Design a protein around this motif. Structure first.
Motif, mmCIF file in Angstrom:
data_model
loop_
_atom_site.group_PDB
_atom_site.id
_atom_site.type_symbol
_atom_site.label_atom_id
_atom_site.label_comp_id
_atom_site.label_asym_id
_atom_site.label_seq_id
_atom_site.Cartn_x
_atom_site.Cartn_y
_atom_site.Cartn_z
ATOM 1 N N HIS A 1 0.827 -1.195 0.000
ATOM 2 C CA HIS A 1 0.000 0.000 0.000
ATOM 3 C C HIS A 1 0.865 1.249 0.000
ATOM 4 C CE1 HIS A 1 0.196 -1.006 4.438
ATOM 5 N NE2 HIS A 1 0.314 0.297 4.610
ATOM 6 N N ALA B 1 4.536 0.656 1.876
ATOM 7 C CA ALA B 1 4.530 -0.710 2.403
ATOM 8 C C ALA B 1 4.732 -1.707 1.278
ATOM 9 C CB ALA B 1 3.207 -0.996 3.100
ATOM 10 N N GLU C 1 -2.337 -1.486 12.090
ATOM 11 C CA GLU C 1 -2.917 -1.875 10.802
ATOM 12 C C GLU C 1 -2.503 -3.300 10.452
ATOM 13 O OE1 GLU C 1 -1.535 0.839 7.567
ATOM 14 O OE2 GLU C 1 0.484 0.630 8.231
ATOM 15 N N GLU D 1 7.649 -0.053 5.165
ATOM 16 C CA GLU D 1 6.908 -1.021 5.948
ATOM 17 C C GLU D 1 6.928 -2.354 5.226
ATOM 18 O OE1 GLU D 1 2.908 0.200 6.419
ATOM 19 O OE2 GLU D 1 2.192 -1.795 7.040
HETATM 20 MN MN LIG Z 1 1.062 1.140 6.375
#
Ligand SMILES: [Mn+2]
Ligand SMILES: C[C@H](N)c1ccc(OCC2CC2)c(F)c1
Ligand SMILES: [Mn+2]
Lengths: 137, 137
Positions: A7, B69, B98, B113
């Motif tokens: 993401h 991410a 998350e 991430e």
């Molecule tokens: Mn994230």
């Protein structure tokens, strides 16, 4: 092993205008919204908007070249660029490299791009006309 | 119509250490370098590293929550995170707000991430443990 981009999260100063920009102007799908963020998708892209009081509305001269390019077809490029222009969206750069590109700013000054063309296309052009110091692997 | 992320471009202050980080440490595929940048891939992601004299090495307390991410499997997540830790990679977040994530910094302080799971999986998890005020469309 990393398998792709999971993401992209953008810090935003005001959630409502950012949701309006990505969902309504850019046409991304809104999946969920909470008091401090939202989840959208754009094709395979999972985008998160995260409300962050540390986010500054940042003029493009004051940020580095980090930027996020979205795919669009060549056939759709010009009308989408014209949509952004009608909406008064600011441009931060002119295109000077292969493949159509439109360089535009989000409400907080995140640097965005519409681009037509893949990595394979770019590498093929570079093989024919290599940048200074270019080496391929 | 936008169809996904065409590419991610990160401004870097020193090209060679950044190439090493993404290629050697994170295992991404290096396709080309030149005096002012590099092209890598991570699955379907096109990553560009762009040498930018304006890029500052930025501590995580001085940057907002914008972050990138990368997907990793449940089977690979913990050992990859532990390897980054053992290699001295700096971090920026500890609380898993998350899901299954490891938060780490690149040499210039870009916020990265490792994350296990898709958007669909996150939405399903959020239905049981929603963020404050969450609505699902
Ligand atoms: Mn994230
Ligand atoms: C500037 C310096 N002579 C140099 C070192 C290594 C290179 O390639 C391998 C590294 C991974 C990209 C390169 F193309 C140039
Ligand atoms: Mn670009």
């Amino acid at each position: 092993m990393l398998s792709g981009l999971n993401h992209l999260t953008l810090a935003v100063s005001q959630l409502a205008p950012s949701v309006a920009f990505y969902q309504q102007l850019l046409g991304m799908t809104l999946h969920a919204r909470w008091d401090s963020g939202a989840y959208l998708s754009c094709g395979d892209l999972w985008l998160c908007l995260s409300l962050d009081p540390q986010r500054r509305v940042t003029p493009p001269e004051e940020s580095d070249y980090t930027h996020y390019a979205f795919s669009i077809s060549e056939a759709d490029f010009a009308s989408f660029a014209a949509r952004l222009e009608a909406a008064g969206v600011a441009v931060w750069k002119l295109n000077r490299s292969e493949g159509a590109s439109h360089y535009f700013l989000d409400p907080d000054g995140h640097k965005l791009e519409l681009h037509v063309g893949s990595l394979a296309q770019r590498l093929a052009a570079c093989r024919e006309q290599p940048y200074k110091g270019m080496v391929f692997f």
